[PDB]
C-alpha cells in the first residue's frame, strides 16, 4: 500500500519509516533526531527518477507539503519557493506575474529538489541544466542544521549542494533565477543526416530550442525547433502507417493514442531486429505526416505527457562552444547508428539528442569551467509494452546489453557523463569498483562531493546504497 515506485515500475521501495513534514521546523526535528540515532533518512521528491536514486528501505523524508511559493522579486525576476512544489505548481503561481523556468525537463509533476538535485535538463544550445537556475537555497544539514547557500553565502559549498543527490542535506527552499512568460513557435519536420549535417552549426545558435528524435534502421531524423513567437494529415492518417503494420501482425486498435499503437507493434517481437526495422519505418512515416507548427506559452511547448514505461540511459559530452563550434555530438550519432547496425540491436525510436549550455555545478554531468560550452545528450531508450514479466525481464537485460555497449565503445572517447536519475549501478564487484573510477574521471569535484557529505552528514544518514555504492 506504501510501495513508492518510479514511472517506469523498473524500482520499487517500501521505507520502513517515511516522514512527510508540514514546516522547516518539523523537518529540523526529524533530521535532528534522525542523525542523534544514526536513522536513515533519504530526501524524495516526486520519486519519479527512472533509477530510484530516492529509493530507502530505511527511512525516506517528502517535502510535498511544502510546496509554497514563498517570494518573487518582480525586479530581479526570481522566485523562492518551497522545495517539496512540483514544477507544474511553480508554473501555475508564476502565470499571473508573468514569469516562467528558462527550461524544462519534461514532466512537470517532479519537485523543485528532485529537479535541481540531479542537474535535470531541457535544450537550448544558449541554456544550462536547471541546476544553474538556482541563485540560492537553504539546506537542513545533519551537522549543521538549516544553512543558506548561494554565489555571495559559501559559493563552493552552493554550487555542489544544489545539484548533490539528496547527499548534502535537504533543500527547503531554492530560489530560482525566472525568464519572462513567453509563446514558442515550435516546428516540426523530417531531415536525413545528410539534411542535418549541413545546417547543424546554425541551426543549433539561431533557435532557442533544438532537438533532433533519431529514428534507428531509417535516415529520418525528427527535428524540432522552438523560437520566441512575435498538405494537412488527419490523426487517422497520421497513424495510418503504425494501425496497418500492428494489423499484419498476429493480433480497439482505432482507441490507441500514437505512444500506444508503438508499444503494442513492439510488444509483438520486441527483440526482433527485422520486426524493429518495420515498426520504426512505419513511425517515420507517422513523423513524416506531423511536420508543421504549434504555438503555446513556453511550458506547454517544451514539457511533455511521456506515459510509456521505459529503460532510458541519456549521456552529456562535450561539444565545443558558442564560438568554437565542434562535430563531436554528430560524430557520435553517427557511431551510435553504425554500432546499433553492426551489433543488431533491436534498437526502436526515438534515440533522443538535445543540447544545453555548461553548468558551473562540479555534479553536473554537464560541468564546464567554461559558461559559453555546449554539451550534447543523447539518450538511448527500450521500451516495455506490457506488464508481461518475462518479456520485461528479455527487453532489461537487451537494454543493458544496449547500454554496455554505448560504455564501452563510445562514453570514454567522447567524455561521456551519465544522467544521475539513469545511472544504474553494476552488481558485478569489479564493474562497481570501474564505475567508481569513471566517476572520478567524469566529475573533477567528486573528492570535494565526499569531503561535503563527510562536513554536512557525517553519519552518512541522508544516503541509500547507490550513493553508498557509486562514492564509497
Ligand atoms: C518520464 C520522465 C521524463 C523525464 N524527462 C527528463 C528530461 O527531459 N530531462 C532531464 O534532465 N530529466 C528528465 N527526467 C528525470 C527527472 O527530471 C529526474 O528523475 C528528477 O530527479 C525527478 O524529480 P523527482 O521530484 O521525482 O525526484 P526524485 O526521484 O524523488 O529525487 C531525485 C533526487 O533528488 C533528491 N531530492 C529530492 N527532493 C529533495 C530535497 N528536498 N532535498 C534534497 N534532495 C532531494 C533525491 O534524494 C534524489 O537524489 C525524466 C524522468 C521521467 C520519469
Redesign the pocket.
Known sequence: EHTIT???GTHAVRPKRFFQPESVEELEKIVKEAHEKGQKI?????????NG??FSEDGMVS?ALMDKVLHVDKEKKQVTVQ??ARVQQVVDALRPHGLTLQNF???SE??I???I??????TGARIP?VDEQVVSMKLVTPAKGTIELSEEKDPELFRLARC????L????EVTLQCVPRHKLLEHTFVATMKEVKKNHEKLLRENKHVRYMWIPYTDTVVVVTCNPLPPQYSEDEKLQPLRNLLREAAPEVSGLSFTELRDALLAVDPLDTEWVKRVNQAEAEFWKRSEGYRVGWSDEILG?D?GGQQWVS?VAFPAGTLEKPSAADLEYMEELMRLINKEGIPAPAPIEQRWTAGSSSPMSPAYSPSPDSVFSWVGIIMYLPTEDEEQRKAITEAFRQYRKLCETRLWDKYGAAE????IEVPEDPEELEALRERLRKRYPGVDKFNKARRELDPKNILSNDMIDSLFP
Open positions: 518510479n514511472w517506469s533519504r530526501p524524495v521528491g516526486s520519486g519519479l527518477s527512472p536514486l530516492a517535502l522545495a517539496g525537463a519534461s514532466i517532479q519537485q529538489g528532485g529537479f538535485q540531479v542537474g535535470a535538463h531541457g541544466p548533490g543527490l539528496g547527499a542535506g535537504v533543500v527547503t511533455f511521456c541519456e544522467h544521475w536519475a539513469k
